[PDB]
Ligand SMILES: Nc1ncnc2c1ncn2[C@@H]1O[C@H](COP(=O)(O)OP(=O)(O)CP(=O)(O)O)[C@@H](O)[C@H]1O
């Protein structure tokens with residue numbers, strides 16, 4: 001099996017940390033991330049090694065700053081190329097509330113501050129429009145959903161209050177019943193759906209009416225490749241499912257999916273039964289976590305001393321995911 005690739009990324013201090021005069025307890029070198037314990041400075045700092053340790057604590061003027069472009073060119077680009085090979089792929093952002101999950105996955109729409117999802121979509125349509133072999137034609141379908149307190153809402157159709165039911169097809173696996181699946185033929189169109197979708201996510205008074213720290217957003221693309229050949233006249237089809245996930249803060253019930261995800265990751269790392277069905281998230285993502293898919297985790301980290309316990313926990317869960325291996329033959333030309 002192909003190992004689930006893992007990257008961790010530390011962001012600059014935020015308003016909260018600055019108001020408390022937080023010092024940085026995170027260091028990076030190569031693919032290694034080290035964390036210092038602010039309360040017990042007498043211990044030896046704990047180090048963790050990953051596929052990538054992104055230092056984004058400073059600002060783009062730094063030669064060592066890990067940009068949106070590097071984060072995408074490393075893992076995003078790799079997954080898209082796998083989609084083109086015909087493999088199902090998944091990228092999920094994990095981490096404590098405010099560590100930088102949405103920035104990494106969505107980013108902002110200016111200043112080349114766009115995250116993994118916008119860059120991958122753009123890259124996808126660019127590659128498709130660069131095609132010169134008329135025997136190839138493409139189809140791109142998108143779906144966008146939110147999972148909040150186990151409830152699933154269609155973000156591309158906030159015009160229906162149905163809490164869509166997650167089901168298990170008798171033969172083809174889990175799916176969200178009646179979740180809208182829209183055909184898109186340009187990056188501009190997909191971006192427009194992404195934008196309105198982002199506008200439909202649940203907010204929380206508790207988060208100063210900002211998007212609720214407890215909702216999960218799953219962005220799916222169904223990429224179909226059709227290859228003709230004037231001959232026998234059969235068109236062959238290659239279908240890849242791209243799942244881009246932005247999880248709720250790691251710190252019918254509020255934290256079921258996240259706690260269950262932790263258990264699934266731990267169990268998989270150990271095994272190499274798994275409670276996939278214990279939550280809607282782990283259920284829908286069953287094949288991406290141990291199944292037929294190329295998967296990657298990007299763990300967001302706060303650099304502040306005040307978030308030590310939470311950051312250590314994220315690093316430890318990212319270390320375990322690194323141990324997961326999914327289960328995913330041509331002729332010499
Ligand atoms: N690599 C980076 N470089 C510069 N700023 C970053 C950054 N990563 C995150 N930020 C900033 O840090 C703040 C918090 O990040 P963000 O809102 O994306 O976190 P998050 O999605 O983990 C919160 P929640 O758990 O509630 O969903 C934002 O103001 C964001 O722009």
Ligand SMILES: [Mg+2]
Pocket residue numbers: 101102103246
């Ligand atoms: Mg977020």
